Design a protein around this motif. Structure first.
Motif, short mmCIF file in Angstrom:
data_model
loop_
_atom_site.label_atom_id
_atom_site.label_comp_id
_atom_site.label_asym_id
_atom_site.label_seq_id
_atom_site.Cartn_x
_atom_site.Cartn_y
_atom_site.Cartn_z
N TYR B 207 0.84 -1.20 0.00
CA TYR B 207 0.00 0.00 0.00
C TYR B 207 0.88 1.26 0.00
O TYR B 207 2.04 1.18 0.39
N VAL B 208 0.32 2.41 -0.42
CA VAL B 208 1.05 3.67 -0.43
C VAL B 208 0.67 4.51 0.79
O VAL B 208 -0.50 4.83 1.01
N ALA B 209 1.66 4.84 1.60
CA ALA B 209 1.48 5.64 2.78
C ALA B 209 1.20 7.09 2.36
O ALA B 209 1.90 7.62 1.49
N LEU B 210 0.20 7.74 2.99
CA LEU B 210 -0.10 9.14 2.68
C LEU B 210 1.08 10.02 3.16
O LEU B 210 1.50 10.95 2.46
N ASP B 211 1.66 9.69 4.33
CA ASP B 211 2.84 10.35 4.88
C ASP B 211 3.82 9.21 5.14
O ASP B 211 3.60 8.44 6.08
N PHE B 212 4.86 9.08 4.28
CA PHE B 212 5.86 8.02 4.40
C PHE B 212 6.61 8.03 5.75
O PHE B 212 6.73 6.99 6.40
N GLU B 213 7.11 9.22 6.16
CA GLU B 213 7.84 9.41 7.40
C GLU B 213 7.02 8.97 8.61
O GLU B 213 7.52 8.20 9.44
N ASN B 214 5.76 9.42 8.72
CA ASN B 214 4.91 9.05 9.84
C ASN B 214 4.67 7.54 9.87
O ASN B 214 4.67 6.94 10.95
N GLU B 215 4.53 6.92 8.67
CA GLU B 215 4.31 5.47 8.55
C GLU B 215 5.54 4.69 8.97
O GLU B 215 5.42 3.70 9.68
N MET B 216 6.74 5.15 8.59
CA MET B 216 7.99 4.52 9.00
C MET B 216 8.15 4.61 10.52
O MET B 216 8.66 3.67 11.12
N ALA B 217 7.72 5.73 11.14
CA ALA B 217 7.77 5.89 12.60
C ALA B 217 6.77 4.96 13.31
O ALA B 217 7.09 4.40 14.35
N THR B 218 5.55 4.81 12.75
CA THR B 218 4.53 3.92 13.31
C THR B 218 5.01 2.48 13.25
O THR B 218 4.89 1.76 14.24
#
Ligand code: ATP
Ligand code: 3AT
Ligand code: LAB
Ligand code: MG
Ligand code: MN
Ligand code: MN
Lengths: 398, 360
Positions: B207-218
């Protein structure tokens, strides 16, 4: 509130009706969950009301492609497969010699046994009280059996129930009048357990999402174990399929001819249905391909069908914007089953589904008996495809 | 007086069927396999099925036909085995990638008429067909398939060649990237057979993260974004941040060592290379097609990325149909079924006299 799309107008359901189904309520709930989980629309052919407790009991196995003899829907043999097919449902009685030959070939080939028919008090009381398909038990003196009668249309065939005990199971053995003498009623039993089999769950169709269309959707003809061995490459097969490569009996039993005409998608979805149902190791309810791919499809015998749809179809505008919810136009029961009652309603259901990106597989035998051929490629084109072509013609001056 | 044929020649999959139909009748891999050591050649499904006893070749590299002998086998298989038609009895529309060499269209025209004797033939640009499939004649298409990705701006049925962007990163590279980053979990997938297990993992779990940085942190603080996947052999594996890092390469090509701009940058750059007057029509009609655009969240992230680059006055719309994997084929089915379009096909009479140049 009205579904309107091109030449399709559907008025909302006014006073919804309760349709008596033969599929047990927990099985409809499993299939509604399978539909959401897998994102497919699963259609299942009718199961007679009186087969419900038999299927729900999880005691019996069901009939696969090797048992073409029809089940009965009348008398004490209700829900079971009589060896003498003059006791089966009307479809079987139409070509009696064909179905009698079917009954014998399944037994004589070892794909089934000839079993005795025993009914408990619960089933007797269900057929007399709940369904009124048997008249009350009346002792026949100089016989020791309880005489009961059933209706075969313009016939009232008598049956005699004898109180017997098997493995400390207090039961009634069904007996009939065979050529003047009092004979035990035989039904088709499972080849391994030896117990009577019930009717199966027949997939009518499985509508998959357009975005997921691929090589798995090609309907394939049953290959011999030898044709299949050359067709595949051993190392790419999962252990489930490597086992079939190294066991001609396992392939012949779980695959090949037993599946009929099937797509790779449906072969896997069948396993998901059976696992999800807890129907495993002989107790499976889905044995083969869908009516989609059935050369011998009889449209008369496909209704009422239970359809299980992905949960979004139930939302305020699940069928698209301004279109509405599937419950608005089709009957949906407490378990989530969309009960399709006839070919016209099925044709409308399929159009709504195609419009929402779910692909239909059309069988030409479905059109037989229909006033108009509803199930054809042209008649079932997507309204998004037709609308796009109209727009492109208008814009490009065509 | 006959049904036209539509044949989308993709790098990974051939989509073939009849004009007038809402979906192709045949979808099979663009592969030809010859014995590794009982036929001389095997195409599509049969070639993939007998992988261990054949040497598989892909005749289409980045949307461009590179093996004309293998392509002839794919076309033969399409007409005779898949469609079960007589090529000489149907006019055939074929698709071509944007910026396809003039010699390539000539050679496939030469093969259609000399080898298969088709009554008539048309060659359409894949992205242009995608736009038609959504009932549009103006807008910008992002077509991402298996071997190539393109940005194609279109104004009233015509692609604007100067603003076409080609990106050599597509689904196949994302699968190789998924195999590479799966090594970072201790997992190994190396073979051609294993590459198809990773291709299934990608299609089902990416899937494509809307905010990549926030997704990598989660993904780094919790297992909420994790998913399990049962391999053929019954072994269950866990997938974490690879679910969204694999399609992130579409937005950040530097992930696969590419010094290229992401799909959102190339979309904006393509719109900027067009007339200011038509830019509004391109921003509001941004159409997505091809299997590599199938990732959940790709349209939300495109909307967010384009919105950031465009003027705040500008209204951005991303059109991503659910059937967008088959948009190119659908478009060709729509065009070749418009009987008013008949006066636009190259007939065999036109070919016999002028030669393969007639296609231009
Ligand atoms: N659901 C999905 N999610 C992600 N990727 C997918 C999905 N379905 C298909 N793909 C990928 O899309 C590709 C195939 O799509 P497509 O039909 O558009 O390609 P093509 O026409 O063969 O290629 P090309 O346009 O590059 O010449 C493969 O890489 C496949 O893995
Ligand atoms: N995909 C298929 N390919 C080949 N044959 C199939 C396929 N689907 C169904 N069939 C055929 O249709 C038959 C299904 O009917 P079957 O289950 O035997 O009876 P029925 O009418 O459902 O009644 P019962 O209540 O089960 O006795 C079996 C087989 O002859
Ligand atoms: C189901 C399917 C999907 C697909 O996209 O397949 C196409 C065609 C395929 C050809 C080789 C393969 C061994 C055969 C069949 C797979 C076909 O290569 C692909 O899988 C390539 C390599 S891995 C990837 O993501 N794309 C894409
Ligand atoms: Mg393509
Ligand atoms: Mn049945
Ligand atoms: Mn059956």
């Amino acid at each position: 509130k009205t579904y309107q799309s091109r030449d399709l107008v559907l008025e909302p359901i006014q006073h919804p009706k309760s349709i008596e189904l033969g599929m047990p309520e927990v099985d409809q709930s499993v299939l509604a969950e399978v539909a959401e989980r897998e994102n497919v629309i699963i259609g299942v052919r009718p199961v007679d009301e009186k087969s419900k407790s038999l299927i729900a009991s999880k005691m019996y196995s069901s009939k696969g492609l090797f048992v073409k003899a029809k089940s009965s829907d009348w008398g004490p043999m209700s829900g079971f497969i009589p060896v003498d097919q003059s006791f089966a449902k009307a479809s079987a009685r139409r070509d009696l010699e064909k179905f009698n030959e079917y009954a014998e070939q399944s037994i004589l080939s070892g794909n089934a046994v000839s079993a005795n028919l025993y009914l408990n008090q619960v089933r007797i009381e269900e057929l007399v009280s709940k369904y009124e398909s048997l008249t009350p038990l009346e002792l026949d003196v100089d016989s020791g059996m309880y005489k009961t009668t059933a209706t075969n249309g313009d016939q009232t065939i008598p049956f005699f129930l004898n109180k017997v005990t098997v493995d400390d199971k207090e039961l009634w053995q069904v007996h009939y009048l065979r050529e003047g003498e009092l004979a035990p009623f035989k039904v088709i039993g499972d080849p391994v357990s030896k117990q009577p089999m019930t009717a199966d769950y027949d997939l009518l169709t499985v509508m998959y999402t357009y975005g997921d269309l691929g090589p798995q959707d090609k309907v394939k003809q049953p290959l011999t174990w030898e044709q299949w061995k050359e067709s595949v490459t051993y190392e790419d097969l999962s252990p489930k399929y490597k086992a079939r490569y190294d066991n001609q009996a396992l392939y012949e039993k779980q695959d090949g001819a037993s599946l009929g005409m099937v797509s790779d998608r449906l072969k896997e979805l069948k396993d998901v249905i059976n696992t999800s149902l807890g129907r495993t190791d002989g107790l499976e309810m889905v044995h083969h391909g869908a009516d989609d791919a059935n050369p011998y499809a009889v449209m008369a015998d496909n209704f009422p069908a239970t359809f299980f749809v992905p949960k979004h179809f139930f939302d305020d505008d699940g069928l698209g914007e301004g279109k509405g919810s599937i419950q608005t136009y089709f009957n949906v029961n407490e378990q989530g089953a969309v009960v399709i009652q006839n070919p016209q309603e099925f044709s409308n259901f399929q159009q709504v589904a195609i419009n929402a990106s779910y692909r239909a597989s059309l069988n030409d035998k479905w059109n037989s008996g229909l006033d108009s051929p509803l199930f054809t490629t042209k008649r079932k084109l997507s309204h998004d495809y037709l609308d796009a072509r109209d727009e492109v013609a208008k814009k490009l001056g065509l | 007086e006959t049904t036209a044929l539509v044949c989308d020649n993709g790098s990974g999959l051939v989509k073939a069927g009849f004009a007038g139909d809402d979906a192709p009748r045949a979808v099979f891999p663009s592969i030809v396999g010859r014995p590794r050591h009982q036929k001389d050649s095997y195409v599509g499904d049969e070639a993939q099925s007998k992988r261990g006893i054949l040497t598989l070749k892909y005749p289409i590299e980045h949307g461009i036909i590179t093996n004309w002998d293998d392509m002839e086998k794919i076309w033969h298989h399409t007409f005779y085995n898949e469609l079960r038609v007589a090529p000489e009895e149907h006019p055939t529309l074929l698709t071509e990638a944007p910026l396809n060499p003039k010699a390539n269209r000539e050679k496939m025209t030469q093969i259609m008429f000399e080898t298969f004797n088709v009554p008539a033939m048309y060659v359409a640009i894949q992205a242009v067909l995608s736009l038609y499939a959504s009932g549009r004649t103006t807008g910008i298409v992002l077509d991402s398939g298996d071997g190539v990705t393109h940005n194609v701006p279109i104004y009233e049925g015509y692609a604007l060649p100067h603003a076409i962007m080609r990106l050599d990163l597509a689904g196949r590279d994302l699968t190789d990237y998924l195999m590479k980053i799966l090594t970072e979990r201790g997992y190994s997938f190396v073979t051609t057979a294993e590459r198809e297990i990773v291709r299934d993992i990608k299609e089902k779990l990416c899937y494509v993260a809307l905010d990549f940085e926030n997704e990598m942190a989660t993904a780094a603080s919790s297992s909420s974004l994790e998913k399990s996947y049962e391999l053929p052999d019954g072994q269950v594996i866990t997938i974490g941040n690879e679910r969204f890092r694999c399609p992130e390469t579409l937005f950040q090509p530097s992930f696969i060592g590419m010094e290229s701009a992401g799909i959102h940058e190339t979309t904006y750059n393509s719109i900027m290379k067009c007339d200011i007057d038509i830019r509004k029509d391109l921003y509001a009609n941004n159409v997505m097609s091809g299997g590599t655009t199938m990732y959940p969240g790709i349209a939300d992230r495109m909307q967010k990325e384009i919105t950031a680059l465009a003027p705040s006055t500008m209204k951005i719309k991303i059109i991503a149909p659910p059937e967008r994997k088959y948009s190119v084929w659908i478009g060709g089915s729509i065009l070749a079924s418009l009987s008013t379009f008949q006066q636009m096909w190259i007939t065999k009479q036109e070919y016999d006299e002028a030669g393969p140049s007639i296609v231009h």
